[PDB]
């Protein structure tokens, strides 16, 4: 489309020329919340519908955690054409996150590095924000547009599992699915929660708390994992997810690695790397986790999706749904419809009747 080119060649590089990335993101959140967005001409076809996690999803393309950290732009994001929205990470208490600058663009790599450190309005603020549109969300959910809430831990917390449990109690009842984010690279010690013994203790507490919620307010619980795990760590996570009946996995968070070949001047900034250089590392992690869980555990695939091909590769590797963030940063809102249009085209070319038929297809080759 004309919009796709104008955004990608004029609008977004102009905004990028004028504003540091944190400013630009704040402005984007504001515009989205106000619905100041291009017409999302693409109409979701039936071949894009997916049923998973106890819900219908109109299309399989979601906004990944971190874009709407505090639940300010949910309805704007649906307007953009996302099949599902994930907010967060939310921490129990408000906290500022790290000092600025803390986000960096690598335009020559189609990548970003961030070290926000869980800047969060906190659970209470977010709770009230979601409660203000709770029945609007219930109607959206019923219409195939579910809401996920991603939970974090405060920096100075003395009991990580208690932070997650507090999140489950507070925001669980307002979410279709919850995400235990134990893979930020920007909170000290957090990724050690992916270890077998820590994860089993943590997840048992999280699941107990979730199962204590009233039926109609009981969300699915997913775990979001890093792209930098060892084979032992992957194995362990798969074992615990089966042992406990975790509902799904989000694969992956940003990478602490710096793949050879990065060109951006800012490549050696501390933080998590997202975008194109993370793409195949995340696809491979999806593939491994789908096989370790025997294809029985839904996966939301994320990292470096910017086209229909990128989405289909993750679907074929084992994702039931995909998310993106960094593509939006570079191409703007039209990227969403682009991905969907291209995905539908490729599904037809590859002889799939819909998305559902393509889930895990590479493992049946
Ligand atoms: C600026 C920024 C903030 C993010 N914040 C969060 C967060 O709060 N919680 C989380 O689980 N993931 C967060 N992520 C990771 C994304 O959700 C996603 O997993 C990652 O960016 C890979 O997707 P992408 O390559 O499409 O951006 C963040 C990523 C970026 C770039
Ligand atoms: C001065 O800033 C604008 O004009 C923006 C912005 N930001 C506009 S104009 C129409 C539009 O869609 N956006 C926008 C909204 C969300 C974004 O997510 C990255 C990016 C955008 F460019
Ligand atoms: O807040 C952040 O720094 C953040 C959290 C997270 O989970 N992933 C990420 O890349 N950044």
Curated annotation (Swiss-Prot):
<comment type="subunit">
    <text>Monomer.</text>
</comment>
<keyword id="KW-0472">Membrane</keyword>
<dbReference type="InterPro" id="IPR001295">
    <property type="entry name" value="Dihydroorotate_DH_CS"/>
</dbReference>
<dbReference type="GO" id="GO:0009220">
    <property type="term" value="P:pyrimidine ribonucleotide biosynthetic process"/>
</dbReference>
<feature type="topological domain" description="Mitochondrial intermembrane">
    <location>
        <begin position="1"/>
        <end position="365"/>
    </location>
</feature>
<dbReference type="InterPro" id="IPR005719">
    <property type="entry name" value="Dihydroorotate_DH_2"/>
</dbReference>
<dbReference type="GO" id="GO:0106430">
    <property type="term" value="F:dihydroorotate dehydrogenase (quinone) activity"/>
</dbReference>
<feature type="binding site">
    <location>
        <begin position="181"/>
        <end position="186"/>
    </location>
    <ligand>
        <name>substrate</name>
    </ligand>
</feature>
<dbReference type="GO" id="GO:0004152">
    <property type="term" value="F:dihydroorotate dehydrogenase activity"/>
</dbReference>
<dbReference type="GO" id="GO:0006207">
    <property type="term" value="P:'de novo' pyrimidine nucleobase biosynthetic process"/>
</dbReference>
<dbReference type="GO" id="GO:0044205">
    <property type="term" value="P:'de novo' UMP biosynthetic process"/>
</dbReference>
<keyword id="KW-0665">Pyrimidine biosynthesis</keyword>
<feature type="binding site">
    <location>
        <position position="275"/>
    </location>
    <ligand>
        <name>FMN</name>
    </ligand>
</feature>
<dbReference type="GO" id="GO:0005743">
    <property type="term" value="C:mitochondrial inner membrane"/>
</dbReference>
<comment type="function">
    <text>Catalyzes the conversion of dihydroorotate to orotate with quinone as electron acceptor. Required for UMP biosynthesis via de novo pathway.</text>
</comment>
<feature type="binding site">
    <location>
        <position position="252"/>
    </location>
    <ligand>
        <name>FMN</name>
    </ligand>
</feature>
<keyword id="KW-1133">Transmembrane helix</keyword>
<comment type="pathway">
    <text>Pyrimidine metabolism; UMP biosynthesis via de novo pathway; orotate from (S)-dihydroorotate (quinone route): step 1/1.</text>
</comment>
<feature type="binding site">
    <location>
        <position position="181"/>
    </location>
    <ligand>
        <name>FMN</name>
    </ligand>
</feature>
<keyword id="KW-0812">Transmembrane</keyword>
<keyword id="KW-0225">Disease variant</keyword>
<dbReference type="GO" id="GO:0004151">
    <property type="term" value="F:dihydroorotase activity"/>
</dbReference>
<dbReference type="InterPro" id="IPR013785">
    <property type="entry name" value="Aldolase_TIM"/>
</dbReference>
<dbReference type="InterPro" id="IPR050074">
    <property type="entry name" value="DHO_dehydrogenase"/>
</dbReference>
<feature type="binding site">
    <location>
        <begin position="253"/>
        <end position="254"/>
    </location>
    <ligand>
        <name>substrate</name>
    </ligand>
</feature>
<feature type="binding site">
    <location>
        <position position="304"/>
    </location>
    <ligand>
        <name>FMN</name>
    </ligand>
</feature>
<dbReference type="GO" id="GO:0005654">
    <property type="term" value="C:nucleoplasm"/>
</dbReference>
<protein>
    <recommendedName>
        <fullName>Dihydroorotate dehydrogenase (quinone), mitochondrial</fullName>
        <ecNumber>1.3.5.2</ecNumber>
    </recommendedName>
</protein>
<keyword id="KW-0288">FMN</keyword>
<feature type="binding site">
    <location>
        <begin position="65"/>
        <end position="69"/>
    </location>
    <ligand>
        <name>FMN</name>
    </ligand>
</feature>
<dbReference type="GO" id="GO:0006225">
    <property type="term" value="P:UDP biosynthetic process"/>
</dbReference>
<dbReference type="InterPro" id="IPR005720">
    <property type="entry name" value="Dihydroorotate_DH_cat"/>
</dbReference>
<feature type="binding site">
    <location>
        <position position="224"/>
    </location>
    <ligand>
        <name>FMN</name>
    </ligand>
</feature>
<comment type="similarity">
    <text>Belongs to the dihydroorotate dehydrogenase family. Type 2 subfamily.</text>
</comment>
<keyword id="KW-0496">Mitochondrion</keyword>
<feature type="active site" description="Nucleophile">
    <location>
        <position position="184"/>
    </location>
</feature>
<feature type="binding site">
    <location>
        <begin position="114"/>
        <end position="118"/>
    </location>
    <ligand>
        <name>substrate</name>
    </ligand>
</feature>
<keyword id="KW-0560">Oxidoreductase</keyword>
<keyword id="KW-0809">Transit peptide</keyword>
<keyword id="KW-0285">Flavoprotein</keyword>
<feature type="binding site">
    <location>
        <position position="69"/>
    </location>
    <ligand>
        <name>substrate</name>
    </ligand>
</feature>
<dbReference type="GO" id="GO:0005739">
    <property type="term" value="C:mitochondrion"/>
</dbReference>
């Amino acid at each position: 489309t004309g919009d796709e080119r104008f955004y990608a060649e004029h609008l977004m590089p102009t905004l990028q020329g004028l504003l540091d990335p944190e400013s630009a993101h704040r402005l984007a959140v504001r515009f989205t919340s106000l619905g100041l967005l291009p017409r999302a001409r693409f109409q979701d076809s039936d071949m894009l519908e997916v049923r998973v996690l106890g819900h219908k999803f109109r299309n399989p393309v979601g906004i990944a955690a971190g874009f709407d950290k505090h639940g300010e732009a949910v309805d704007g994001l649906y307007k953009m054409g996302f099949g599902f929205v994930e907010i967060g990470s939310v921490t129990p208490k408000p906290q500022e996150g790290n000092p600025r600058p803390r986000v960096f663009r690598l335009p020559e790599d189609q990548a970003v590095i961030n070290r926000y450190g869980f800047n969060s309005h906190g659970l209470s603020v977010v709770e009230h924000r979601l409660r203000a549109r709770q029945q609007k969300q219930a109607k959206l959910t019923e219409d195939g547009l579910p809401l996920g809430v991603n939970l974090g831990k405060n920096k100075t917390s003395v009991d990580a599992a208690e932070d997650y449990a507090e999140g489950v109690r507070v925001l669980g009842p307002l979410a279709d699915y919850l995400v235990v984010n134990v893979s930020s690279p920007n909170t000290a010690g957090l990724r050690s929660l992916q270890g077998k013994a820590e994860l089993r203790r943590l997840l048992t507490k999280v699941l107990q708390e979730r199962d204590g919620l009233r039926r109609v307010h009981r969300p699915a619980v997913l775990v979001k994992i890093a792209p930098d795990l060892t084979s032992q760590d992957k194995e362990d996570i798969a074992s615990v997810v089966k042992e406990l009946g975790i509902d799904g996995l989000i694969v992956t968070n940003t990478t602490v690695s710096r793949p050879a070949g990065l060109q951006g001047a800012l490549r050696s900034e501390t933080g998590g790397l997202s975008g194109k250089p993370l793409r195949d590392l995340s696809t491979q992690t999806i593939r491994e986790m789908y096989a370790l869980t025997q294809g029985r555990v839904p996966i939301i695939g994320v990292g470096g999706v910017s086209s229909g091909q990128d989405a289909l590769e993750k679907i074929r590797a084992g994702a039931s749904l995909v998310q993106l963030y960094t593509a939006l940063t570079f191409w703007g809102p039209p990227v969403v419809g682009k991905v969907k249009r291209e995905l539908e085209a490729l599904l037809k070319e590859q002889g799939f009747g819909g998305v559902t038929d393509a889930i895990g297809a590479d493992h049946r080759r």
